[PDB]
Design an enzyme around this catalytic site. Structure first.
Site, PDB file in Angstrom:
ATOM      1  N   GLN A 281       0.827  -1.209   0.000  1.00 47.65           N
ATOM      2  CA  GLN A 281       0.000   0.000   0.000  1.00 47.65           C
ATOM      3  C   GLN A 281       0.854   1.250   0.000  1.00 47.65           C
ATOM      4  OE1 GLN A 281      -3.550   0.307   2.532  1.00 47.65           O
ATOM      5  NE2 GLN A 281      -2.706   2.204   3.359  1.00 47.65           N
TER       6      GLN A 281
ATOM      7  N   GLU B 157      -3.022  -7.578  -2.214  1.00 47.63           N
ATOM      8  CA  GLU B 157      -4.475  -7.463  -2.233  1.00 47.63           C
ATOM      9  C   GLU B 157      -4.902  -6.344  -3.178  1.00 47.63           C
ATOM     10  OE1 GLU B 157      -6.795  -5.096  -0.888  1.00 47.63           O
ATOM     11  OE2 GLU B 157      -5.537  -3.791   0.356  1.00 47.63           O
TER      12      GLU B 157
ATOM     13  N   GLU C 202       5.171  -3.973  13.586  1.00 52.00           N
ATOM     14  CA  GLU C 202       5.991  -3.354  12.540  1.00 52.00           C
ATOM     15  C   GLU C 202       7.481  -3.234  12.882  1.00 52.00           C
ATOM     16  OE1 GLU C 202       2.482  -0.852  10.285  1.00 52.00           O
ATOM     17  OE2 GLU C 202       4.219   0.252  11.073  1.00 52.00           O
TER      18      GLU C 202
ATOM     19  N   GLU D 241      26.113   6.560  -9.691  1.00 54.27           N
ATOM     20  CA  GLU D 241      26.685   7.775  -9.146  1.00 54.27           C
ATOM     21  C   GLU D 241      26.148   8.077  -7.734  1.00 54.27           C
ATOM     22  OE1 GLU D 241      27.179  10.719 -12.320  1.00 54.27           O
ATOM     23  OE2 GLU D 241      27.221  12.301 -10.776  1.00 54.27           O
TER      24      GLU D 241
ATOM     25  N   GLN E 270       0.762   3.941  -3.162  1.00 54.34           N
ATOM     26  CA  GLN E 270       0.191   5.278  -3.003  1.00 54.34           C
ATOM     27  C   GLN E 270       1.266   6.370  -3.123  1.00 54.34           C
ATOM     28  OE1 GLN E 270      -3.977   4.428  -0.635  1.00 54.34           O
ATOM     29  NE2 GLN E 270      -2.267   5.078   0.691  1.00 54.34           N
TER      30      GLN E 270
ATOM     31  N   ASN F  61       7.877   8.345   8.951  1.00 55.54           N
ATOM     32  CA  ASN F  61       6.531   8.930   8.947  1.00 55.54           C
ATOM     33  C   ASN F  61       6.317   9.967  10.059  1.00 55.54           C
ATOM     34  OD1 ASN F  61       4.994   8.233   6.673  1.00 55.54           O
ATOM     35  ND2 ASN F  61       4.142   6.388   7.573  1.00 55.54           N
TER      36      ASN F  61
ATOM     37  N   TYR G  70      -2.712  10.446   4.540  1.00 56.89           N
ATOM     38  CA  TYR G  70      -1.727   9.847   3.635  1.00 56.89           C
ATOM     39  C   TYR G  70      -1.528  10.693   2.384  1.00 56.89           C
ATOM     40  CZ  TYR G  70      -1.419   5.341   6.163  1.00 56.89           C
ATOM     41  OH  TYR G  70      -1.204   4.363   7.100  1.00 56.89           O
TER      42      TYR G  70
ATOM     43  N   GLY H 148       3.264  -6.125   5.821  1.00 56.13           N
ATOM     44  CA  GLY H 148       3.727  -7.489   5.562  1.00 56.13           C
ATOM     45  C   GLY H 148       4.221  -7.685   4.133  1.00 56.13           C
TER      46      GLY H 148
HETATM   47  N1  LIG Z   1       3.839   7.536   4.078  1.00 57.94           N
HETATM   48  C1  LIG Z   1       2.897   6.589   3.884  1.00 57.94           C
HETATM   49  N2  LIG Z   1       2.903   5.541   4.739  1.00 57.94           N
HETATM   50  C2  LIG Z   1       2.005   4.555   4.612  1.00 57.94           C
HETATM   51  C3  LIG Z   1       1.010   4.623   3.537  1.00 57.94           C
HETATM   52  N3  LIG Z   1       0.249   3.525   3.675  1.00 57.94           N
HETATM   53  C4  LIG Z   1       0.726   2.814   4.735  1.00 57.94           C
HETATM   54  N4  LIG Z   1       1.769   3.446   5.288  1.00 57.94           N
HETATM   55  C5  LIG Z   1       2.572   3.004   6.431  1.00 57.94           C
HETATM   56  O1  LIG Z   1       3.064   1.693   6.156  1.00 57.94           O
HETATM   57  C6  LIG Z   1       2.908   0.854   7.301  1.00 57.94           C
HETATM   58  C7  LIG Z   1       1.853  -0.203   6.965  1.00 57.94           C
HETATM   59  O2  LIG Z   1       2.243  -0.915   5.783  1.00 57.94           O
HETATM   60  P1  LIG Z   1       1.418  -0.953   4.392  1.00 57.94           P
HETATM   61  O3  LIG Z   1       2.335  -0.505   3.277  1.00 57.94           O
HETATM   62  O4  LIG Z   1       0.058  -0.300   4.522  1.00 57.94           O
HETATM   63  O5  LIG Z   1       1.138  -2.537   4.319  1.00 57.94           O
HETATM   64  P2  LIG Z   1       1.336  -3.482   3.037  1.00 57.94           P
HETATM   65  O6  LIG Z   1       2.768  -3.420   2.568  1.00 57.94           O
HETATM   66  O7  LIG Z   1       0.209  -3.198   2.090  1.00 57.94           O
HETATM   67  O8  LIG Z   1       1.252  -4.962   3.696  1.00 57.94           O
HETATM   68  P3  LIG Z   1      -0.030  -5.828   4.208  1.00 57.94           P
HETATM   69  O9  LIG Z   1      -1.248  -4.933   4.298  1.00 57.94           O
HETATM   70  O10 LIG Z   1       0.561  -6.277   5.527  1.00 57.94           O
HETATM   71  O11 LIG Z   1      -0.151  -6.904   3.160  1.00 57.94           O
HETATM   72  C8  LIG Z   1       2.540   1.810   8.423  1.00 57.94           C
HETATM   73  O12 LIG Z   1       3.752   2.301   9.015  1.00 57.94           O
HETATM   74  C9  LIG Z   1       1.766   2.903   7.701  1.00 57.94           C
HETATM   75  O13 LIG Z   1       1.693   4.177   8.351  1.00 57.94           O
HETATM   76  C10 LIG Z   1       1.058   5.806   2.649  1.00 57.94           C
HETATM   77  O14 LIG Z   1       0.237   5.942   1.717  1.00 57.94           O
HETATM   78  N5  LIG Z   1       2.006   6.721   2.885  1.00 57.94           N
HETATM   79 MG   LIG Z   2      -2.011  -3.970   2.585  1.00 60.54          MG
END
Ligand SMILES: Nc1nc2c(ncn2[C@@H]2O[C@H](COP(=O)(O)OP(=O)(O)OP(=O)(O)O)[C@@H](O)[C@H]2O)c(=O)[nH]1
Ligand SMILES: [Mg+2]
Ligand SMILES: Nc1ncnc2c1ncn2[C@@H]1O[C@H](COP(=O)(O)OP(=O)(O)CP(=O)(O)O)[C@@H](O)[C@H]1O
Ligand SMILES: COc1cc(C(=O)c2cccc(-c3ccc(C)c(O)c3)n2)cc(OC)c1OC
Ligand SMILES: Nc1nc2c(ncn2[C@@H]2O[C@H](COP(=O)(O)OP(=O)(O)O)[C@@H](O)[C@H]2O)c(=O)[nH]1
Ligand SMILES: [Ca+2]
Ligand SMILES: [Ca+2]
Ligand SMILES: [Mg+2]
Lengths: 437, 309, 424, 53
Positions: A11, A71, A183, A254, A15, A206, A224, A144
């Site tokens: 995610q 997902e 985490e 570089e 994003q 973050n 986000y 994950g």
């Molecule tokens: N900066 C930022 N951090 C994010 C974002 N989405 C999730 N996080 C951070 O990432 C961590 C959660 O991991 P995600 O990337 O949402 O999870 P994923 O990799 O999709 O893994 P699973 O849902 O476990 O399959 C937390 O520390 C969140 O605050 C985003 O859009 N921007």
């Molecule tokens: Mg996810």
């Protein structure tokens, strides 16, 4: 030119990819449908922007991008969203079931069934490249998928593309922004397994981004979208030299040579000024002296730490806007006398400056005001180990009780991989201290 | 209710600041490893500054200045003075000191050697000021509190840690008349109680035996030395604009020579107070350093001097 | 991971289960015939989690109604939302289970269980991505207790990788049908410790006290208690049923709430307690949801320590105020949250409030204080078992005394395990 | 303060300014992924054996 493939895992990766590719499109004058009016070589080319975009006979400009999530919900908003025509559907890869914030589930269980598919879609992009440099990989430490599937990709990318460079953009977890309890475990596991496979990695805590959004954008409770739009400006700064004419940081090799003399200590601290609110009516525009000076204030860093109690191994200044060399050197002269900027004895105390004359682009209706000039300092300071220590302490607290461990073991992972990964992190903290004191 | 933790059990001073806070009814003490505190009262070695200021919703303060060890170790104090322009290598109030690793009379220290033959080698002050009746050496200890804003607060009471053995030019090997440390002495308390002459009595001696005052003859030079030393390191240690904040009690040790010239010996990072003064000093630390950041429901002299040039 | 299969078993199971569907069908704008007549789109975006879409744009609860006698399930069919359930999913024997765990688990329930599983498989088959199961039952009777935990065991055999969830009502002498309840609950707890990922412990002691003391109802019916249960059930299923920010599922909840697999017994709570005109300020919600008087399990959270916490706010409110308030209790009561799991309180917000209230909060605590619940039932058990009293009812259905001794030991172990971490 | 390697173009310029001088194989990955699938499928067996009892 030499092509660069961006990979967005999880995610957080996806994003942040959205945010970056939106910004890149605005910067190069490329539209949502993918036309680029200012391009005269239709059907192809080897301009600097072509490192990040391929082209088609009908004149579409197509990100060298692979989005990977275990997902579908988040990548389904790329498929139906503003930039749906921009990507070929085969670049956007989704699973059915996420990794439930479980490194092991992402790496071992659900990873195994999807790693060959993803490497195939990566090969489809690598075969369109006259001379591939390597990869920019975006992910969370905490997720994950972000922790677990990324580390397995980075393992396989070393085998299939042994010649090529790999850079990370890594989101370090913060209690203030949707952290899960596990985490810290995920962060250490992926850091251990990815360490040898990554050439240079830019950590973005973050916490730091969130307070920047409160303090400087007057955003009460940052979303986000707020954080990502800001993170993407720092990303754009860092990748500007790959996409625009210039002579500093023109290939991925570089970045390693300029910022990473000691290969394991490959986490450069990013610092960025100025961050200014678009709802601010009256704003006195800041100068070259004032924004170079803002690069040595912790409140502007991507990770909170204290460079004054550590040592530099390399420092880059990447300016965007109305800047000239003599203004920069005058500012560097002032700042050297005022602040504590200690280098390691085996490195030249110095700064590699890059200036691009186009000021930073801002997303219309965004939170950032247009500014005449901005800068991103990339400094390899030992102070960033502060972040490793915090993360290591949390791990130690939970792991002393074997707390949550059963969820990892239950996906086939051995308990020993925890203390192993933690030993690498214990060695990593010790490398920083030798070099830094 | 504000909160604090305690991570130094030896600290005589912060033992009393711990007890004063609890007995306010507005400060709960937590366990050593509880992360959710307003105030650390930290350890001497390995104090984990990198974990401070990352607790959402708490304002965190600590009783040490990260980097202050540069003024408080002997080896690096010399290196600080030789290298900084604002206290030059031609510094008038620091005894000529050198560093080599493992009147021409010197002293060696970090077990103390005084000869011409034989870590830091320092110019030994062969002609010190001697309190009569006695003909005896002393050193002055001044207590300084640097708060979160970098206000330098000098506590109005100091103390003379006196000897009680006549000083000797020929005889160096005898340590009781040359070295004036409180531990090394325990004539232990012949002239004044516990080898401790406080500032009121020492002012009167100067008035009688020397026709001057403590404020003029000595204390101006102390205030200059404290202010010169702390403003030198302010860029390296200041917690203005930082994610956590720092204060610290320092102990400055001085020697006054025959012609009333004050010389810096050592700055002390974790200083003990004097037995009488705990009550008043530890309360002032609370008022000025702690309650300023954490308000509830003057014993210091502030050091500041913006001379235009 | 979207679809959940809901199972409700026995008198209590079907009573609280029926209220859950009344409550949540009103929140998703589904009427008693299954037709949507709402106003927001947010009511239908995650409707798939609990309902199937049938011919004629009807929504049918993914609900299987199990009992060993027809009484209660006939009341459900006659009752206000009875017509919405798929008629094939009413699965019922005739002879009852006589508040006897053994009848539910080993004899009467054995005869009926495979036909329940045929409906479970039927509902499972037409799920795109099944995340798991939730069961409503009591542990004090025979059907929900004994047959309910038989089902759980069977469902784990067939779907070992899906999540098992229970809303498990615990018995109390204050709200008591028969003296054998401590036996029936002790036999069930042993099953729940092994074969479930998450269990919401609804103590009937606690529901009675909330109705008596903190709601001024002098004579509480089961309906008064079940008002509190259905409101809490709506509460804890909010993130599953509406968007969104954390893609919320049963597994992620399980991974983060449960540091040790056996310790998955949660202490749910609700604020404000109802049976109002003034809306609560965010500080009040935060005080009340963490208050003992609002917990549905009769345990003093001050007698233990929180391993993990999940708080879910509902309604239009400042998240700045929520974060400050949520940070205020953690920082002002920090001894009661274990230091060795950093940042163990997780907060979530949903814009839509439940029927009647403008704003509300649902609490889900994995406290080591839950041990008191198991000790209370372990004492009531030993009082009888040391004289082998009422055992003939069970030994007549083929059970041995050994099986009781085991369950007694397994529960006292659970209590030792909670004690290990409350002092650690 | 020497300002070396100055390169310019129309879109920008860049320079250096000095204040003072001084992998496992595809076999082994697929191996230890499969070793974790064995331990996964062993754990599921001990569950299905315990349930058969
Ligand atoms: N900066 C930022 N951090 C994010 C974002 N989405 C999730 N996080 C951070 O990432 C961590 C959660 O991991 P995600 O990337 O949402 O999870 P994923 O990799 O999709 O893994 P699973 O849902 O476990 O399959 C937390 O520390 C969140 O605050 C985003 O859009 N921007
Ligand atoms: Mg996810
Ligand atoms: N250059 C010098 N001239 C005269 N006396 C000196 C001297 N250097 C040290 N001394 C004497 O030696 C004594 C102890 O030395 P020093 O002050 O360096 O160690 P210390 O660590 O015990 C001070 P503290 O622990 O109280 O901070 C002092 O009381 C002082 O009188
Ligand atoms: C089933 O209802 C809920 C689900 C969830 C989650 O899916 C979820 C996702 C990511 C992290 C967490 C989580 C949960 C608890 C703790 C202590 C934590 O650190 C993280 N959960 C979450 C819920 O509560 C907000 C649910 O309850 C409605
Ligand atoms: N809260 C609540 N408890 C109930 C209800 N009905 C029964 N109980 C409790 O459940 C236990 C009896 O179990 P019951 O469900 O009637 O037996 P079953 O039909 O054999 O499963 C006793 O502890 C009762 O107090 C109800 O509607 N609400
Ligand atoms: Ca072209
Ligand atoms: Ca029969
Ligand atoms: Mg009954």
């Amino acid at each position: 030119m030499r092509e660069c493939i961006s990979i967005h895992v999880g995610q957080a990766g996806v994003q942040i990819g959205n945010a970056c590719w939106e910004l890149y499109c605005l910067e190069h004058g490329i539209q949502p449908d993918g036309q680029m009016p200012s391009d005269k070589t239709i059907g192809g080319g080897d301009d600097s922007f072509n490192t990040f975009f391929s082209e088609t006979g009908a004149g579409k400009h197509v990100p060298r991008a692979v989005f990977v999530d275990l997902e579908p919900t988040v990548i389904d908003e790329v498929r139906t969203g503003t930039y749906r025509q921009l990507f070929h559907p085969e670049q956007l890869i989704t699973g059915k079931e996420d990794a439930a914030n479980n490194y092991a589930r992402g790496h071992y269980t659900i990873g195994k069934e999807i790693i060959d598919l993803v490497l195939d879609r990566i090969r489809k992009l690598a075969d369109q490249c006259t001379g591939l440099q390597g990869f920019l990989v975006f992910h969370s430490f905490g997720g994950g998928t972000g922790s677990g599937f990324t580390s397995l990709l980075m393992e396989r990318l070393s085998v299939d593309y042994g010649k090529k460079s790999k850079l990370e953009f890594s989101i370090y977890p913060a209690p203030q922004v949707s952290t899960a309890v596990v985490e810290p475990y995920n962060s250490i596991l992926t850091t251990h397994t990815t360490l040898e496979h990554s050439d240079c990695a830019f950590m973005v805590d973050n916490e730091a981004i969130y307070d920047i959004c409160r303090r400087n954008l007057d955003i009460e409770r940052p979303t986000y979208t707020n954080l990502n739009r800001l993170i993407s400006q720092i990303v754009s700064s860092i990748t500007a030299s790959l996409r625009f004419d210039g002579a500093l940081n023109v290939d991925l090799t570089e970045f390693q040579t300029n910022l990473v003399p000691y290969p394991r200590i490959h986490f450069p601290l990013a610092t960025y000024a100025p961050v200014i609110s678009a709802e601010k009516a009256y704003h006195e525009q800041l100068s070259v002296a004032e924004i170079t000076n803002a690069c040595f204030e912790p409140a502007n860093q991507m990770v909170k730490c204290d460079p004054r109690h550590g040592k530099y191994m390399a420092c880059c200044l990447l300016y965007r806007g109305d800047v000239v060399p003599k203004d920069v050197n005058a500012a560097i002269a002032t700042i050297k006398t005022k602040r504590s900027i200690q280098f390691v004895d085996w490195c030249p105390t110095g700064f590699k400056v890059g200036i691009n004359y186009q000021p930073p682009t801002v997303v219309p209706g965004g939170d950032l005001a247009k500014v005449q000039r901005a800068v991103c300092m990339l400094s390899n300071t030992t102070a960033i180990a502060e972040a490793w220590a915090r993360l290591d302490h949390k791990f130690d607290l939970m792991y002393a009780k074997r707390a949550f461990v059963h969820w990892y073991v239950g996906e086939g992972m051995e308990e020993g991989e925890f203390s192993e990964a933690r030993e690498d992190m214990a060695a990593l903290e010790k490398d920083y201290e030798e070099v830094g004191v | 209710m504000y909160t604090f933790v305690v991570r130094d059990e030896n600290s005589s001073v912060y033992a009393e600041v711990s007890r004063l806070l609890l007995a306010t009814g507005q400060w709960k003490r937590l366990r050593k490893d509880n992360p959710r505190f307003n105030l650390m009262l930290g350890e001497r070695n390995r104090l984990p500054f990198g974990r401070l200021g990352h607790e959402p919703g708490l304002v965190q303060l600590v009783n040490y200045y990260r980097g202050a060890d540069k003024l408080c170790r002997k080896a690096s104090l010399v290196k600080l003075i030789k290298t900084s322009p604002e206290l030059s290598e031609s510094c008038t109030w620091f005894p000529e000191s050198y560093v080599i690793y493992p009147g021409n009379v010197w002293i060696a220290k970090s077990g103390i050697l005084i000869s011409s033959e034989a870590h830091v080698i320092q110019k030994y002050l062969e002609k010190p000021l001697l309190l009569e009746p006695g003909h005896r050496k002393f050193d002055i200890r001044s207590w300084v509190l640097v708060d979160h804003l970098y206000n330098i607060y000098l506590y109005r009471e100091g103390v003379l840690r006196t000897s009680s053995e006549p000083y000797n030019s020929a005889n160096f090997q005898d340590k009781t008349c040359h070295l004036t440390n409180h531990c090394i002495q325990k004539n232990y308390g012949r002239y004044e109680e516990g080898n401790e002459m406080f500032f009121e009595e020492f002012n009167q001696y100067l008035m009688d035996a020397l026709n001057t005052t403590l404020e003029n003859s000595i204390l101006l030079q102390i205030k200059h030395i404290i202010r010169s030393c702390l403003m030198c390191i302010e860029p390296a240690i200041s917690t203005k604009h930082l994610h956590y904040q720092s204060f610290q009690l320092f102990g400055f040790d001085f020697m006054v020579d025959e012609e009333l010239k004050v010389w810096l010996i050592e700055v002390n990072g974790a200083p003990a107070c004097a037995q009488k003064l705990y009550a008043e000093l530890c309360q002032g630390i609370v008022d000025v350093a702690i309650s300023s950041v954490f308000p509830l429901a003057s014993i210091f002299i502030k050091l500041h001097h913006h001379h235009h040039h | 991971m979207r679809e959940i299969v809901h199972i409700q078993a026995g008198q209590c199971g079907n009573q609280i289960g029926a209220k859950f569907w009344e409550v949540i069908s009103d929140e998703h704008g589904i009427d008693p015939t299954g037709s949507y007549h709402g106003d927001s789109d947010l009511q239908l975006e995650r409707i798939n989690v609990y309902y199937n879409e049938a011919t004629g744009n009807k929504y049918v609860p993914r609900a299987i109604l199990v009992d060993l006698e027809p009484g209660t399930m006939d009341s459900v069919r006659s009752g206000p939302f009875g017509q919405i359930f798929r008629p094939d999913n009413f699965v019922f024997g005739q002879s009852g289970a006589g508040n006897n765990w053994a009848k539910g688990h080993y004899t009467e329930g054995a005869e009926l269980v495979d036909s329940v599983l045929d409906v479970v498989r039927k509902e499972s088959e037409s799920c795109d991505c099944l995340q798991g199961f939730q069961l409503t039952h009591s542990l004090g009777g025979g059907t929900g207790s004994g047959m309910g935990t038989l089902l759980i065991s069977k469902i784990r055999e067939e779907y070992p990788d899906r999540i098992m969830n229970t809303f498990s009502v615990m018995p109390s002498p204050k709200v008591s049908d028969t003296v054998v309840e401590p036996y029936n609950a002790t036999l069930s707890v042993h099953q729940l410790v092994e074969n479930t990922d998450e269990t919401y412990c609804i103590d009937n002691e606690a529901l009675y006290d909330i109705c008596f003391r903190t709601l001024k109802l002098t004579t509480p019916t089961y309906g008064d208690l079940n008002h509190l249960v259905s409101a809490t059930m709506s509460g804890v299923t909010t993130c599953l049923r509406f968007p969104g920010q954390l893609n919320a599922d049963l597994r992620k909840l399980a991974v983060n709430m449960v540091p040790f697999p056996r310790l998955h017994f949660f202490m749910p709570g609700f604020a404000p307690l109802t049976s109002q005109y003034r809306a609560l300020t965010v500080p009040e919600l935060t005080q009340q949801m963490f208050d003992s008087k609002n917990m549905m399990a009769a345990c003093d959270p001050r007698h233990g320590r929180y391993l993990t916490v999940a708080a879910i706010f509902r309604g239009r409110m400042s998240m700045k105020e929520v974060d400050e308030q949520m940070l205020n209790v953690q920082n002002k009561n920090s001894s009661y949250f274990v230091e060795w799991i950093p940042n163990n309180v997780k907060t979530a917000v949903c814009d839509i409030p439940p029927r009647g209230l403008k704003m509300s909060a649902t609490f889900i605590g994995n406290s080591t204080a839950i041990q008191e619940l198991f000790k209370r039932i372990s004492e009531q058990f030993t009082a009888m078992f040391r004289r082998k009293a009422f055992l003939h009812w069970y030994t007549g259905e083929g059970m041995d005394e050994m099986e009781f001794t085991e369950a007694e030991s397994n529960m006292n172990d659970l209590v030792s395990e909670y004690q290990q971490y409350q002092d650690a | 303060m020497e300002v070396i390697e100055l390169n310019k173009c129309t879109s920008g310029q860049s320079f250096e300014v000095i204040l003072k001088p001084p992998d496992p194989s595809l076999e082994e990955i697929q191996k230890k992924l499969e070793a974790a699938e064995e331990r996964r499928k062993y754990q599921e067996a001990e569950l299905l054996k315990h349930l058969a009892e």
